[PDB]
Design a protein around this nucleic acid. Sequence first.
RNA 1: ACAUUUAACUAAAACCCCUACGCAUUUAUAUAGAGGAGACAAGUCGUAACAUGGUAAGUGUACUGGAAAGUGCACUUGGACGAACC
Length: 191
Amino acid sequence: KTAFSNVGRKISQRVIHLFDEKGNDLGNMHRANVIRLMDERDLRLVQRNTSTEPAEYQLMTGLQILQERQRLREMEKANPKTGPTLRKELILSSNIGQHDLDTKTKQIQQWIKKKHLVQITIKKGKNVDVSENEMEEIFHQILQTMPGIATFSSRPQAVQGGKALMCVLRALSKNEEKAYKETQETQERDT
RNA sequence: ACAUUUAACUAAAACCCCUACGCAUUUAUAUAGAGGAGACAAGUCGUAACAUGGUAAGUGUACUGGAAAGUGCACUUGGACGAACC
Ligand SMILES: [K+]
Ligand SMILES: [K+]
Ligand SMILES: [K+]
Ligand SMILES: [Mg+2]
Ligand SMILES: [Mg+2]
Ligand SMILES: [Mg+2]
Ligand SMILES: [Mg+2]
């Protein structure tokens, strides 16, 4: 996390693009001169933008820093930003028992409702001879319990030297969800 | 409920009742279906226990969880704390 607080007296860069407490642009100056300004006016230094090639810092009072920090949290409370998608992994065996496959199927369903990406890998069972067409059937068994909830983000694909398959499931988008409801309703009208 | 009659110059005859047992009661067997334990064995998912077993273990109780189990509170040592001062 990047907090909006006083940077302190030790500045990271040597050349600093400084601004005034009222927003007036003071141009670039050496950090030694900035510390002198902070002491002469009794102000604190905050970092407004870092993407710019010349580091942009601004002088502010303790009251301004509070007002900005309050403004930012209200912007998020009102317009909360979405977080990055978390990737969950599962490694199954070809000869996985049905009771255990049901346990992991219920777990995959809970990850999809939370809008996660589920990477499912299927390896050849121990002391078992299996074909890639039979291992690929487990994916459809898993995804069949989630008719209009999940779909393939990355279809089954041999990996690890052809020993194991791998796919990535995701939650259906809102447009894809309304389409499923539409197609389902059409079948209801036909039947 | 039933109630002793005849007979008696030797003495004898006569006497014969009706109500219970059931859709009651006792115990057991059979049978739809639902569970438990054990044996055989060691597939499947984990790795709970045994070493400070990788969060010391356990008891009671409560709640919770695919599964061993997890967690709270009190209790136990059937754990330990390295055994002069440093
Ligand atoms: K334990
Ligand atoms: K122990
Ligand atoms: K207990
Ligand atoms: Mg263990
Ligand atoms: Mg332990
Ligand atoms: Mg305990
Ligand atoms: Mg818990």
